[PDB]
Amino acid sequence: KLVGFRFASYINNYMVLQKEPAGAVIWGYGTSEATVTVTLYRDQETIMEKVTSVKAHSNSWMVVLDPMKPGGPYEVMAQQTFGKTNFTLRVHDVLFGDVWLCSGQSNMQMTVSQIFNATRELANTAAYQSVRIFSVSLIQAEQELEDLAKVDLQWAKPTTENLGHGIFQYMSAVCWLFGRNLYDTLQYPIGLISSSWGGTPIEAWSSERSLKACGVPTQGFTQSNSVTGPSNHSVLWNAMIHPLHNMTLKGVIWYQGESNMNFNRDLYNCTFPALIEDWRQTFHHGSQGQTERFFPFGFVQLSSYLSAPSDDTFPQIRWHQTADFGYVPNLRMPNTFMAVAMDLCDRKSPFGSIHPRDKQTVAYRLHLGARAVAYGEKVIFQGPLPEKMELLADKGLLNLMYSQEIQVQRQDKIFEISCCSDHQCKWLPAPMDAFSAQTLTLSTGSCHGTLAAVRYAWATWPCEYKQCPIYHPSSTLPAPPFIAFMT
Template identity: 50%
Template structure:
């Protein structure tokens, strides 16, 4: 609990300053062992450098070699690769020319399908919490082409250009990476989904986990999405501790402002090209803005689709697949209202989108 308390305090008071703005580097999302989106989509590479510098890129592997050029403008550079078929591994190298000459290389890069996994504790549920956890952890090394990446828990009042922190950098799966204390290691749902895809498709899969237990959909939504549902002026909300992660936390800590997770944990990912997203959330909205969920949830989906499409320069499909899981039949009766709140949220999850009159 102390770790999470300290994390929340630091996230609120500390500005994003993990790197010097003119440091030549890839954006925090990139790393060794990563998966980039395969053809027919085109993967996007971007990062930071010295203003006005020329950056030369090379993609080298057994299947093909590619080169490209970009320039640092307003502190960032960006290149959209030509389509690359599924496979690898590749080395991705970037050279910054000029007075601040530098070279950076990503190794063991695969091309496949990249999926974003979001939501609250349902998605954060760790592989070690499965009934057959030991078996699943032993199987993990047998799927080296399913790579995992985990965004660290952060909040922000403004949209951040880059991730403030990373919990798990791009990694080849292992018992150590996938196992661990409850709600602190990689998502069981995300992993099992990705493993199923790989067994079906037989090409690399990249999994990006960005979720936080006990969070409402409003925290994951942009301000423009919330405006469409009449929530742009909503005040900060204190939510009941619905998940084990929050049961021992002081109630004042369970406070979620609109868009704070969109700002810190989704917006920094928009430049990446993805195949799709999966979502598992809803408990936090069973007693908070519950009558708005039929608007806020589908509007968030539409907004994510538009934002990823625009952020990737049109490479992420504007109607990319967005899979979600309805709440289970657990907790049928509300502790406070006596109504079947989970059933109501399930109904609103699949209801026709509703917008304010």
């Protein structure tokens, strides 16, 4: 059995390895029982060394480096000794910093060349040479893969050519812009790994464990107009995520759910929290405990598209993305953060309205949540949501008391109330009647019955671009959609 001495496929020139307090995992393949010495250099000087042996059967080897301050460059060498043989592997331009994995479906996959202001965005790289980029090839596998089968974009300094290399190819716009925003704040190296595929349901990205935890039914024939990518359970976890699970990382950002609009829709409130938890457990263990057990996990609540009037699948998914709380983090989704995108619509996208071109605001909103949840900063990252409600049935009023200050444009249809009479309920629009800094009063007088619930922005396309009715007055964040039941 002759096994080449090689690094795992996440290791390359120009890469970013996770910084202190974590140790960075370095692993590869080689000859059974050979000794592998991994050395970190700064030019010719030795910074640290780790020694291990190649395991029989798997022919794999692994070390965990001591924690490193962010920065660089460094070189990593691995040297295998077996009898009198001596082979060496070397990578250079290695940095230490925060490694973020970006995944999901086509609004993660959409690249910098596809977005608004693309020419200027593609040109803005000289200040960001320490924001290193990587993109995983579109591969599916019936079993978990130990190593990536193929890499589309190996670790690289960002350029016009590799940020905008092809339509839905690389580099992910949301991922790049998120990292660019992180660099502005952090001023130390950022590594970005994009691993996404259009038209894919969450089940494709989930291991068997999270699917079983949620009671997901066995697959039938799942391709439909809204599921155009790989849809067999776990096949993208298996090939495009699992091979990264031993690599130490900082967190994940995620943009997916469009393809669950008609595929296990009513389970998404389980399957998405369960994906987060299973990725966390699996990466924590694969990385020898170095990746945080509750590593921060950020996501984009679905944007809009120009749909049929009857369709309220997207509002349901948006709600389920928060585990039906309306906000994250929450009791079922610790250390998570969300960007609202329903107001970031695009009627004229050449990629279809499902692919809106403003990824800049998506990445800005994500980065606020990362600053708060992933970095501990006291920064506003959630939009205004009611904390309490007061029904004044005799006056025909419903007061909503918000979490934060509100800036409200008059809009008499954005809120609806569920009006129950004669053993049936109907949703009716609820006009805005009165305002104070944190309380909005709705009129319920058109309901000649009992009020069971209220909802806000519960439509596939609730508003025109950056024209939703309620924002915070200064954070720029929109009020998220919600439903609330009366007691």
